Design a protein around this ligand. Sequence first.
Ligand SMILES: [Ca+2]
Length: 279
Amino acid sequence: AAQTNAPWGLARISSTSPGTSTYYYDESAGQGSCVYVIDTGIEASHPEFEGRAQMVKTYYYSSRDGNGHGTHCAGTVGSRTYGVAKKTQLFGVKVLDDNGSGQYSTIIAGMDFVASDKNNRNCPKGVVASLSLGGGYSSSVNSAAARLQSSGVMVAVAAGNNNADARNYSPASEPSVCTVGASDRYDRRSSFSNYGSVLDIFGPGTDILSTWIGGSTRSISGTSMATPHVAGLAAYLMTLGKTTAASACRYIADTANKGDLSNIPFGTVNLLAYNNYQA
Ligand SMILES: [Ca+2]
């Protein structure tokens, strides 16, 4: 399948070179996989989700996304126009308030919830969790992310936007999950992207067009935007049977475009997510 005039990030993950505008992908498109988006919520009624999104848990008064961030991330995972895995099932877990903030105890609870809730869902091709959030180092937050991964969920987390070593942020610094940095359309490390030896992979994160609340769209930047590209790619590859939740991060790194990025500091991987599609 091919999506013409796609957002640059989708085109980038199906090409060996920058500057293309077509997203090439297998028509299976993540069908039978499930992605939990642990964030500010999802506007499930947005037409771009085609009924494939639902809120399953909130830690606040409402389950609605009053911010936009979670809806944007969910759109990059699996919306029709802006998503990597256009047929995956999306589940929203609202651990962040509508200002985008949240206590670590609530974020931990949300991760433990996903590890249990997945046993109630029909996700024959596997389960992914996308965490476009983070703060200062916390061993308890890292442990919660490691638990979620150990339970059989592919966990993808944002490296952070401090132009610093991600070893000082959580859950970015947990080695057993998939820690995602950001690049821009010219194959530079995004100027805000954290770096360091704990990064596993880069994905598109500057000027990413996706869904927004009120049935709208908008373009924003962040490692929060790169993470759902990798989460969606994992769901896509699990549906194709190429990998499992336990090894998807390693498989993505092994099959990545290598050496293409600039402004990568010594000691950080130079690996860009790639779907290796061949018509
Ligand atoms: Ca890792």
